[PDB]
Amino acid sequence: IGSIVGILITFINGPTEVYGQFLDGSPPLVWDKKDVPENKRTFKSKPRLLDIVLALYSDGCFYRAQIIDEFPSEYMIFYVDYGNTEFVPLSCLAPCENVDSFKPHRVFSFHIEGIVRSKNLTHQKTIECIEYLKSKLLNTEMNVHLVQRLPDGFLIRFLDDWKYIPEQLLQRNYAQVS
Amino acid sequence: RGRG
Numbered sequence: 001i002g003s004i005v006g007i008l009i010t011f012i013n014g015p016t017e018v019y020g021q022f023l024d025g026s027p028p029l030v031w032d033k034k035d036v037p038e039n040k041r042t043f044k045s046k047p048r049l050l051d052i053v054l055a056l057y058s059d060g061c062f063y064r065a066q067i068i069d070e071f072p073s074e075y076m077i078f079y080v081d082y083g084n085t086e087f088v089p090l091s092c093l094a095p096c097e098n099v100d101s102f103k104p105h106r107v108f109s110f111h112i113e114g115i116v117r118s119k120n121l122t123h124q125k126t127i128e129c130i131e132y133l134k135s136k137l138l139n140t141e142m143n144v145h146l147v148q149r150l151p152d153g154f155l156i157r158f159l160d161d162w163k164y165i166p167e168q169l170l171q172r173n174y175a176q177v178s
Numbered sequence: 179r180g181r182g
Contacts, residue, residue, distance in 0.1 A: 008180070010181075027179075028179060028180055057181075059181055082181075138181075139180050139181050139182060
């Protein structure tokens, strides 16, 4: 039915919130080191705040990122199609062409309905919950029920194949009910 | 393709 949409989870923002793309069949926006030879690897002007560039992630592949902060020795960057924040130096950055740069940003924020992060969650337990959700949901394609639109993003509810995830979060005291 |  029409309330069910397909999403790909790319990043775990918190115990009850993940970042992800809507599934529409279009291939991912990522570049091999083989498709970034060094003519395309150096800018005409040193990059700056809010510029949209290619950036090198831990997997050795380039992704679209926006510089959201600048310091003398590092940039702080946000991957616009994946939603994780990193710190990089200029050597990790490559100019991104306007045809690829103009494509809309694919990352959005989804909240699991009916649960929130536990108030008593310690720093360590928070890290551990993030790792559990990474083990289950990271880079996973699945249909979900788009319950609602929010100012932040979307409120989704899991279907029968993934409805155990909020149950486990409640069971493991990573989450409480809203 | 996507990250693993």
